[PDB]
Design a protein around this ligand. Structure first.
Ligand SMILES: Cc1nnc2n1-c1ccc(-c3cnn(C)c3)cc1C(c1ccc(Cl)cc1)=NC21CC1
Length: 126
């Protein structure tokens, strides 16, 4: 039998909170721009491997990540360091490359989203 894992942790009220220029930009500019992209829809929520009939997905992908989780982590002050958020974006793209094969449609879609991501964090404020 095949079940999805619970989604990643997005909220811990015991974690210290800070507002930074970089976390605000990651939510208001970067997340916003990737969310509205033509290719965002597969990445907006956890992979539902039951719904998609892919019982091997959570056999291969042990560090799941998606933009819906990253949005909640940003808005709930889950991240202390901007690099934690940048790591989650990179995990989301590399999961797609790990599960799938070079040249697959979803890989071309993730590669384009990654290119936009790198252009947006090129302008990460200081
Ligand atoms: C991410 C992510 N990494 N690998 C995948 N995915 C997806 C995740 C979600 C969905 C989805 C479907 N219907 N809904 C409501 C969500 C689809 C996919 C697709 C996928 C394939 C082709 C295109 Cl053109 C687009 C997507 N491939 C997989 C499962 C292997």
């Amino acid at each position: 039998g095949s079940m999805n894992p619970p989604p990643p942790e997005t909220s811990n009220p015991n974690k210290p909170k800070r507002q930074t220029n970089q976390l605000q930009y990651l939510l208001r500019v970067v997340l916003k721009t990737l969310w509205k992209h033509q290719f965002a829809w597969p990445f907006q929520q956890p992979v539902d491997a039951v719904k998609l009939n892919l019982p091997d997905y959570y056999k291969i992908i042990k560090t799941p990540m998606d933009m819906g989780t990253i949005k909640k982590r940003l808005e709930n002050n889950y991240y202390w360091n901007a690099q934690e958020c940048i790591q989650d974006f990179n995990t989301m793209f590399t999961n797609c490359y790990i599960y799938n094969k070079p040249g697959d449609d979803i890989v071309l879609m993730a590669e384009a989203l990654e290119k936009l991501f790198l252009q947006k964090i090129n302008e990460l404020p200081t």
